[model samples]
Target: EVSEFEALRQHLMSVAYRLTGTVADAEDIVQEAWLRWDSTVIADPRAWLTTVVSRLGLDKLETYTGTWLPEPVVTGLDATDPLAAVVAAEDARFAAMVVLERLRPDQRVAFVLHDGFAVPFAEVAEVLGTSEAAARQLASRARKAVTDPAHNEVVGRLMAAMAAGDLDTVVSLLHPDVTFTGDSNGKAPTAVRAVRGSDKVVRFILGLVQRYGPGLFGANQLALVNGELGAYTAGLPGVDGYRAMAPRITAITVRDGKVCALWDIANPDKFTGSPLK
Candidate 1:
């Protein structure tokens, strides 16, 4: 029985991560569920565990803040870890999570549980303490509110342009109103607030290349972040007259062959649960 529960651990982690948008919280939720397990009357283990973990995640959502980008569970394109693949296959992209973060707690929970992972509307309603119809509507409303080659291609060009300090190419790839958001919480070297416009966003990326040296580009490890093409780097060591860079994951939102938003997650604390090497 213990082994059976272990088998479902990765799925639980995936669902919990989706719910809370943070790896540490996902693990914490799962760990608590493990301790609180009651097998005597449990007819379906996965369902039971999902309920417990989701409830815990819901509480964390209740105690929330602003600009807290989800802690991305980055993995190699060919990552073989069971959970890593699950994260990618699921709607767990960093850009998607950004929009998900904007959702009301109930909507977010209902959407993720029902639309995201196939949880029944009845169970979703129970989780939100509402009627089945209400749960269905919540997910529907969420659906009303809100991928690949252009993203990877645009990101590829953007990275190359930044590497060479080619300002024009860099600016050309970004959406006119591109947004650059850094989730460092004053704990790392990046903008704490969102930087808008291709002009400012271009400067921010180039400035890093300037401060850290062109070598900073070499430190990047191209990887899949939440199933989308992204780069995770072992940031450059601080040079004289420059500050060191903490490792960070770069995820972008691309639209119409243009990069829309650049999400840079640099807070070291957020890395605690990342499977990235």
Candidate 2:
């Protein structure tokens, strides 16, 4: 017989992982919460578990430094279903996850807990250590930071143009104010800072072509990262050139039919628990 707590595992896992942006943290937090739950009894396990997982997520979120990209949950490609498309549209799951990086931990916690996962702002204050009104206000300031498709079409063409070293096409596909951000936490090589503007982004893109031969030395492939159309690729100098680059995964956000936000996650720590297949 499945215990009540065990039945809520999936929901708890989603809350912890989404809030912390790390798989291992979520699993560890949930497992630890189970230990606490096992030792004591709770009148409402769901609420109790949610509160515990959130605080644990906050602690882990605050511990990091440098560019933080969510651990990729790589899956094999998207399908052509109209119904599925509606659900996956600019609520573009991974793009929203990437946007999550821009929020302060408290702000992130507030917005995610309140709007994303649907706990009351008052209820959320337990973890935030603030009044309901204060936490609700946090969600607004957080909204000031700022997904979808045309994603597959534009993203596919941009990669093709990039592979061909066709500057005109590549330039056309990127938005004028495109922002390409890479997160390696100084643990790997990438634009740890952001490359903004189509002009600079193209230069960076071509530099990647020159250094790694466009297809990342033939190891890149199309895949879905968190339900957003993206690529999965590895680093190598063998089939290609010591500039041996590390592995990377990417998710692109398209707007008005052009690529606007390009997210590259190269952090080794993130990769350890990521579903990179």
Candidate 3:
């Protein structure tokens, strides 16, 4: 029999890539996947490995909703092979992963087992402890949502606009009644809460620029938030005789070509590793 570690490392990358749809994240997921696998005995190692990998991906997706958010899909050239590159650029797994977040725990598990990874209904039922047909239905519904064109374009456009950071150019891309929401594990709730309105959103971001301009701090560090662009500041101004300077994003969203949302999370106590990072 093959050694457990060797077998796991060989298949783990492929297993995680299928679940996460990003080469970078799949690599990380693979590491975590083995951590769990190491602590358990897998009888049908191949099948068990795939099943556990899918479930682990589902769990991480939920965990990310807390604070460690995922970065948006970015297209680029790399030495990581064509399959990895294509999946990274336009893999449907990210959208599917987000949809999984909204599901009941069992439903999410059943749906991913049956649809996302194409596990058999009977096996999916076994894994989720639900009726086979129920797993089938759940998977069907989840698949439809994942493949919906309108849903894909709406999310893709929103993320793309934010990455570009052209506030005025994003005007035509959102509904007049469009809404934005953000959460930071509730530490600085308003620091990244949702907002509405076209013009009001624009004003909010413009105000952030005014408040945290380049010279307002001595040095700044930039990095991606879940893979999307973000930054931090040092030596920021003192407020009410309280001095604090930390990493913050003056804004996080753009609408119809203009920034329509702001999330300046400057509080250091709440600072944690970004999902994208």
Candidate 4:
């Protein structure tokens, strides 16, 4: 007889972790997955578990990732395992997750299971209850949708130039009419309301250097925020104490290697706080 719950926990966690990209959130999701498993009847337990976890993650992604948007930057933060940094880093890269987020629900699940976790496509299709051809098509279309040539080039150049602290390169990629809007509900400091225009935005970011020092603020990952790049911001030694800013994010719209607009959201209240998980 299958010790059904044991298998369910392990499998659901693996699936949810790949989907959500955060260990804390994944654990919470797994707890809810167990509740769901407990509340439902199961024939093909594994497949049902996968479906539940996938749906949960997808809902969270769509609802929460943009609730309190973080800046389009990453940082050097620790993970669950000290030795897991390389694998975590590979997964935490901004572009990959954003692209993956653009997929249809089933497609995102399929791409993550097969591509990120190397689950066999057959099993993925089984969990999704679709044909292998349909599953494959979902993943294929997701890849095509996110790999827009212009977008890739713009992100690539910004990643390289920004990492090197090239202020000029960063500013040049911004739109002249660029507006930096902060979505804090009276939580963040007063100066963070919003900064408008490319020039002011540049000075604002530069001033961050004075406050946090150079390269101290960084985003460890990036994901698409409604098809635009949402850089997951975190791990600034100088500014690390702000719990309200743990997942600080930056949104960017780039054109011809310059940023057209930027929005920064750091209020925790703005984030989706699901009651259960």
Question: Which number leads on lDDT?
Answer: 1
lDDT of 4: 0.55
Give the winner by lDDT: 1 or 2.
Answer: 1
List the candidates' TM-scores in order.
0.87, 0.82, 0.52, 0.48
lDDT of 4 by residue, 1-277 (tens): 4556554565665566557645455667777766776744546767766777777776767242222222122222233322133134244343354444333445677777777667677777876677988778877876676643455478657755665778867777788878676655425542445567887888887666555554444443554432344455553545454323335555556555566666565554433311111
Per-residue lDDT tens digits of candidate 2, residues 154-229?
8777766566667777778778899888875747768878889998888887777677664473677677666667
- Please give the RMSD to the true structure for each candidate, in Å: 3.1, 4.6, 7.9, 9.0
* Total clashes in model 1, counting residue pairs 3 or more apart in sequence or in different chains: 0
Q: In candidate 4, residue 268 scores what lDDT?
A: 49
Number of backbone-clashing residue pairs for each candidate, in the order shown: 0, 0, 20, 20
lDDT (Cα, tens digit) per residue for candidate 3, span 39-115: 43536656766667666655555233343222233222232332333233222333333344334334555554555
Tens digits of per-residue lDDT for model 1, 31-136: 9987878656537777887889999989888223346677787776787655584475537878778778745566788888877788899988887898989988
What's model 1's overall lDDT? 0.77
| Off by more than 4 A, model 2 | 1-7, 39-42, 62-66, 78-92, 214-217, 239-242, 273-277
TM-score of 2: 0.82
Error of 3 at 45 (Å): 3.2
User: Candidate 4 regions off by >4 Å?
Assistant: 1-14, 21-25, 33-52, 58-89, 102-106, 148-204, 207-265, 269-277
| lDDT-based ranking | 1, 2, 4, 3
Task: Give candidate 3's whole-model lDDT.
Answer: 0.47
The alpha-carbon deviation from the true structure for residue 40 of candidate 3, after best TM-score superposition, in angstroms, is 14
Task: Point out the worst 10-residue segment of candidate 4 by lDDT.
Answer: 67-76
TM-score of 1: 0.87
